Amino acid sequence: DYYHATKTTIFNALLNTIDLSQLAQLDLKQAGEEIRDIVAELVAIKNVSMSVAEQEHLVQDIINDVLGYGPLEPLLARDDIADIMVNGAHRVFIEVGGKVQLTNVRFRDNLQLMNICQRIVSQVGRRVDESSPICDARLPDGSRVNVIAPPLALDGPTLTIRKFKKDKLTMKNLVEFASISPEGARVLGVIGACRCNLVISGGTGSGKTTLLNTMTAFIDPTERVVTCEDAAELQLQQPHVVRLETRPPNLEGSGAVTMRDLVKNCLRMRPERIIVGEVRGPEAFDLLQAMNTGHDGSMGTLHANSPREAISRIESMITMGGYGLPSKTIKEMIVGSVDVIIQAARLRDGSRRITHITEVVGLEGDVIVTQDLFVYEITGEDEHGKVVGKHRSTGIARPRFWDRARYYGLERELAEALDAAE
Amino acid sequence: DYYHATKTTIFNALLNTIDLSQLAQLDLKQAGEEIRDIVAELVAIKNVSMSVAEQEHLVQDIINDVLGYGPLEPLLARDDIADIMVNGAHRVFIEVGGKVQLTNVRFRDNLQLMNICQRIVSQVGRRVDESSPICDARLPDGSRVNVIAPPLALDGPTLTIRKFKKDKLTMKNLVEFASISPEGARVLGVIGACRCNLVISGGTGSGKTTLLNTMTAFIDPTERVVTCEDAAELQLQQPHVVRLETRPPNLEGSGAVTMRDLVKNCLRMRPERIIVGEVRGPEAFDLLQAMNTGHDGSMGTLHANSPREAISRIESMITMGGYGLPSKTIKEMIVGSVDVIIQAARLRDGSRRITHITEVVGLEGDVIVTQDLFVYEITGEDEHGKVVGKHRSTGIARPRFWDRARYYGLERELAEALDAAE
Amino acid sequence: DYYHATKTTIFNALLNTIDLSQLAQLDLKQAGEEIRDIVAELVAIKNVSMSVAEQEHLVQDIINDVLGYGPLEPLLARDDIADIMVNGAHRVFIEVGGKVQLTNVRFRDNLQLMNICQRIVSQVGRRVDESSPICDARLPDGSRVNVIAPPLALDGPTLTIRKFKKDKLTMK
């Protein structure tokens, strides 16, 4: 129990034994064996007859502290602990079973915690310190890490690790939550696979980003996706992907890099799909070009309650871009570029479901005509206020994108999904 | 007296002997030691000598102006002082015993006062001069500073320092001060505990911060709360609160961490609630994001005089954030994000009261339709000038957030408070 | 195995050997002639068992890393490789026969990749850094280059070479 004191006695000697720089040069087990030998020699010199199991545990903990991730290691390796949050050296919380729960784990001081955080976030070659007090990273394992330095967090460094749960956003989850019928799931699979241009319009609180992340899961591994986001949220798991992020202007107003810049660059980066996190300005124009230029299969979220409202929003956005384009030209661009619009909305009872899956068919009389392949129809509600509905296929056997599915060999599945939906 | 004339002569000699640039690289104590050496060098030609208790006092006074905050140093050090105000180099007033009073203290010239003000505002990286003649900031020592430059202040630069006072009220204080009726106390308890998005709009001197503290007091201890503010205005008693503070840029215009960065990070720290010390910039948009993409129950303080005014403030703030968001999009985002607005204002008699408790209902055309749950009605003035008024409920049986109450099992409390509130 | 460690040690020794100004001023052949001798002397001091052809290969790799384009150079010299795409130091893809294939060749770390990107775009006189995170250029050879800095690319620089596809879009 008192082995901690022994560690307190030995830690100071460890640095006096071998400099941390020498240990940092090698990640091989040789460092671990050397640390174990040094710890055993120090224990013998101190002449302490501590528990053998306690001695081994102390040696392992010393190795972790010197070169590992400190007391976080038992928590980090555990599979049941979804998320770990640390607020100063004294408090640690873990999200287990979907609920927060405090833990007895502790760190000696904010200095030890800061060293652990710097090691963790430098694993992926990113810096965190009082000069750059805020840092966000994604480890290769897929677990996100976020660290805030003491100069911002008044209670010392704060850290949050969120592990990667795969089956948390897949289309199976959407079907389970009744956000889309299984036939709707099949249709969504076909559309996503066949590189149909997409625009995921959604109302506030509709989880547009979650729907987009689910949709992107159908992209073939070999396609060189490129993602532009105002704030990195998308977690694509394809072997090939490039993640970009905007940079707001500094206090001087200089150094800004807006989404339009990222999309314009992406046009010249040889992508096979452009996944705009959220179209929110003139960048829409450029995105539309990406949809015509040959980067078929791009996607982009947008704020709108109904597909027609989404089209109007895109037109307004392009108009605000300052380009000398009349309404007819903008509508022509939208019709020729966009292939499908998906609408996600938050219903009265707080649930969110895919309300519309519509295909932009063409332009007539400066009015953009759309046909809804799938529509969610409200049929009733419960005494709780829960609103109930059903997904109905409009019966359009041959949507104008049918050729795309045929080229990829998904025509049969598309017909099956459209017919069996009723 | 000879003290002032001797000090002026010594200051003139020191200025003719050295310049501030000669000691800008020295620290406060090092600067004082070098100033003592320079004083000895100057006395070598002036042959000035007096009692140590007086010579050292004169040296300290000279230092207080060479690198300190000028003759304000003896005043700021005091505690009976409530407010300091400077209306030009030749006049300064101080609030003692709750009443203003003229002091014999004086400056040398308006330029010296301007330099002192520049030092005080640069203490937090701010600059006041002809380019930006108006400046406001907070000294982290616990005070608020306002400065106006000569081009606006005709009588020379004007300064105002207001020292912090620890209010830290609790809902019992508000109830006993008649700031809110007991039925209003029950309503606010429900709203706080019900995880309802809540914007505490307030006017000047309304105490829209302490109101935020007492509102937060209702937060469940098990919810991870992350608070963004400046100079740690708030003080929560929950066991799982993360406290963050923005960092003003250094004099080099670098290292700044604005509210936008802190809120965007808090989005990624898995918080159950995001609480903003005060919304005064584009961060509002990022806050609204947090208010709807989960994180139900986030709060935010805003400077506005009326709920309908506060909504316009938020809309303009989002507009100036640089996004090309269509106005209707911003209005829809606000309608779907906010669930309640609380208005705090100071009446003509100087007392703070909760004028409005309103809930955003929806959007009609391009106007946000809101219904007021509680309103404060004024009826006259009493013998001692005190404002006479009472809180009345509109009688709305089922406010929009009712669902949340049902989820949290607070329907009975809310119904009782709304019915008996008349 | 040991070749990589010996190369890393020799690279560190060369970096500490002389200032970057001497290498920059010296011509490619002029600098390489002394670099080969320095590498041979370092190997002899280390007494590393290696072949004369292996010694020449190590010298060439050292020259490429220190002053050349690093492990990306062999891909550049190839003809079948039409496009090259680096998604950070740990991922390299090449477009051959109209198909994108991952290749095992990867850089030491994102810092080396950023240095190589700056060297590549220096040919046209353009410079990329954290203050100008985006860069695009057309080298004199005709190959296009697009580079993104880490502050934007959230997983390391995103070098993208697109070699000149002559007669790609002619009237035929």
Residue numbers in the entry:
A (entry chain B), B (entry chain A): 80 to 501
C (entry chain C): 80 to 251
Reproduce the article's own wording on this structure.
The ATPase CpaF in C. crescentus is the only Tad motor reported to date that is known to be bifunctional, facilitating both pilus extension and retraction at the flagellar pole through ATP hydrolysis. CpaF oligomerization is mediated by interactions between the NTD of one chain and the CAD of an adjacent chain. From these data, we propose that CpaF uses a clockwise, rotary mechanism of catalysis to assemble a right-handed, helical Tad pilus, a process broadly applicable to other single motor systems.
Thirty-six percent of the hexameric particles contributed to the reconstruction of the closed state, while 64% adopted the compact state. Due to this ambiguity, coupled with the ATP-bound configuration, we designated these two chains as ATP*. The closed state of CpaF, harboring two ATP* and four Apo chains, is only observed in the absence of exogenous nucleotides, suggesting that this conformation likely does not participate in processive catalysis. In addition, the spatial position of the 3HBs in the closed state indicates that association with the platform proteins is unlikely. Thus, we hypothesize that this conformation could serve as a pre-assembly state, perhaps when the ATPase is trafficking to the poles.
